Design a protein around this ligand. Structure first.
Ligand SMILES: *[C@@H]1O[C@H](CO)[C@@H](O[C@@H]2O[C@H](CO)[C@@H](O)[C@H](O)[C@H]2NC(C)=O)[C@H](O)[C@H]1NC(C)=O
Ligand SMILES: *[C@@H]1O[C@H](CO)[C@@H](O[C@@H]2O[C@H](CO)[C@@H](O)[C@H](O)[C@H]2NC(C)=O)[C@H](O)[C@H]1NC(C)=O
Ligand code: NAG
Ligand code: NAG
Ligand code: NAG
Ligand code: NAG
Ligand code: NAG
Lengths: 36, 193, 49, 118, 48, 48
């Protein structure tokens, strides 16, 4: 259950990405990695 | 949607990834097009003109459609009525796994839709932003007439703008200046109706 | 068009499809005949276990 | 059809501002329009009035609007600043001057009385 | 970084009984507008 | 573009009658235009 989206710049710039998990609070949970 | 929560059927289905990718691409294009449509329709003006500071337009009453700084939104009375008439069906944007699992003894539509891989994305522009855009358009068209759509906005009295518009349709402006009270009363009655 | 009459214009037909001339066979050249008598005509066969 | 072979009065149809003219150019699987338009730039503040009363009768401008330098009164066009002296062939009379809201007191020059005087 | 999008620059306008802003100078502007007119024409051979 | 940011001379485009002005309002997945127009009411017979 729950959709997942990935926000990323061009791969020729950086490899860091952000992950948006739909239909869930963060205020562990159903996430791949909590991180910070 | 096809055979979720199954392993053998996924291995069988691996020969339709092109079809699935093409469907997803079409849907993504549809969503992007809808966002672009909203942005193009509602963002014609770029500068957020504030609401008029004083109200001496000449008898015309615009409190019916101008925003009221009394609720957490900038929606006027007409906008509130229009929102209250039509009822949505997506039921917000958040539905956690702990809620769809809660109502397992009662049937639900959104939970069944989401358990089969059918999701609804939220619009880019919220209703507050659209209300702000509409308020800016109202302020521009009331305080400055039509000059704010072609370059900078130029101040002009409302009675003179009405005289300009009457002269546009082939009626001399002395008609307005001799009947301003009646025209204002008729406009107020029409907006009330 | 499934008809004996054709109107004036331009139409598209099948591409230039060319028929083959001859047929060839290329197999590796091996002369031996592997044993059909050591598999089917043996004197002792193993158990099933 | 509407912007190259003529002039368009539709707002925001061919470029921002007031449409003057247009030029077509080709492109692979498309067309490119260069719209030439007119945009006012330097605004100036003025005080104004809808009509004036001279001899008990109101005078409304034919084309333009009344403005003031601060002590004098002029009539000027609506998209440019070209002040002119108030005179009878720029204004027309419509009834008495006790019905209009915002009227002001000013004189009107007649281009025929000085001519007959001499 | 993640933020809230802006709705453009913010300003206001002065309004009164008898205050009018009249232009004194002007500018001639040229704008580009691009429009597609056609796509590629294609043909398919069913059997091939 | 044509009825809120200006005045329209096209017949029967924004409301019946002679178009004077217009107001936009939002709605869920839509827009609502309030068109303010001028309509002659009392006709009188004359010879010309
Ligand atoms: C414009 O001119 C007329 C005439 O001089 C002024 O009308 C007079 O106003 C005073 C006081 O209101 C009255 O006592 C007079 O009887 C009026 N005279 C006439 C002929 O009506 C008028 O006041 C002037 N406009 C302004 C703003 O002062
Ligand atoms: C109106 O604006 C234009 C440009 O904004 C002014 O033209 C400039 O005039 C000065 C001196 O004559 C030149 O050095 C500039 O090169 C001109 N600019 C351009 C783009 O040509 C013009 O002076 C202004 N007119 C008035 C009455 O203010
Ligand atoms: C199999 O063995 C028998 C005698 O050993 C012989 O007669 C027969 O020809 C053999 N068959 C084949 C296919 O070799
Ligand atoms: C006209 O009035 C307002 C308020 O005084 C002022 O801010 C504005 O600068 C004036 N317009 C111009 C072009 O100066
Ligand atoms: C305003 O314009 C008139 C006409 O030229 C002039 O006589 C007058 O001195 C000007 N007043 C000011 C304050 O500039
Ligand atoms: C101009 O507006 C102000 C404030 O409402 C008021 O003092 C004044 O009477 C008004 N004058 C006219 C002609 O409307
Ligand atoms: C003008 O002429 C016709 C025929 O006499 C008449 O019916 C009509 O009422 C007249 N128009 C008005 C406004 O009276």
């Amino acid at each position: 259950f729950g959709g997942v989206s990935v926000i990323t710049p061009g791969t020729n710039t950086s490899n860091q990405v952000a992950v948006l998990y739909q239909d869930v609070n963060c205020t562990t949970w159903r996430v791949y990695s909590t991180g910070s | 949607y096809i055979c979720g929560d199954s392993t053998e059927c996924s291995n069988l289905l691996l020969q339709y990834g092109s079809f699935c990718t093409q469907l997803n691409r079409a849907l993504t294009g549809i969503a992007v097009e809808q966002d672009k449509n909203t942005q193009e329709v509602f963002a014609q003006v770029k500068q957020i003109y504030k609401t008029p500071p004083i109200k001496d337009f000449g008898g015309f009453n615009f409190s019916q459609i101008l925003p009221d700084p009394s609720k957490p939104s900038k929606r006027s009375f007409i906008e509130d009525l229009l929102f209250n008439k039509v009822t949505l069906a997506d039921a917000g944007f958040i539905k956690q796994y702990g809620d769809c699992l809660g109502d397992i003894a009662a049937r639900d539509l959104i939970c069944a839709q989401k358990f089969n891989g059918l999701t609804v994305l939220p619009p880019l522009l919220t209703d507050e932003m659209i209300a702000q855009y509409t308020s800016a358009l109202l302020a521009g068209t009331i305080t400055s007439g039509w000059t704010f759509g072609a370059g900078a906005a130029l101040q002009i009295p409302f009675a003179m703008q009405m005289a300009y518009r009457f002269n546009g349709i082939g009626v001399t402006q002395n008609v307005l200046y001799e009947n301003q009270k009646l025209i204002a009363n008729q406009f107020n009655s029409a907006i009330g109706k | 068009l499934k008809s004996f009459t054709v109107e004036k214009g331009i139409y598209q037909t099948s591409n230039f499809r060319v028929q083959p001339t001859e047929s060839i066979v290329r197999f590796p050249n091996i002369t031996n005949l592997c044993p059909f008598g050591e598999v089917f005509n043996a004197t002792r066969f193993a158990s099933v276990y | 059809s509407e912007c190259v072979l003529g002039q368009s009065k539709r707002v925001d149809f061919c470029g921002k501002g007031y449409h003057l003219m247009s030029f077509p150019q080709s492109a692979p699987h498309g067309v490119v329009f260069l719209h030439v338009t007119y945009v006012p730039a330097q605004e100036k503040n003025f005080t104004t009035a809808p009509a004036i009363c001279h001899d008990g009768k109101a005078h409304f401008p034919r084309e333009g609007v009344f403005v003031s330098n601060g002590t004098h009164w002029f009539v000027t066009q609506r998209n440019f600043y070209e002040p002119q002296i108030i005179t009878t062939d720029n204004t027309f009379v419509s009834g008495n001057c006790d019905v209009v809201i915002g009227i002001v007191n000013n004189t009107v020059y007649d281009p025929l009385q000085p001519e007959l005087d001499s | 970084i993640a933020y809230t999008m802006s709705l453009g620059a913010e300003n206001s306008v002065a309004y009164s009984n008898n205050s009018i802003a009249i232009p004194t100078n002007f500018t001639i502007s040229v704008t580009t507008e691009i429009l597609p007119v056609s796509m590629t024409k294609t043909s398919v051979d069913c059997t091939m």
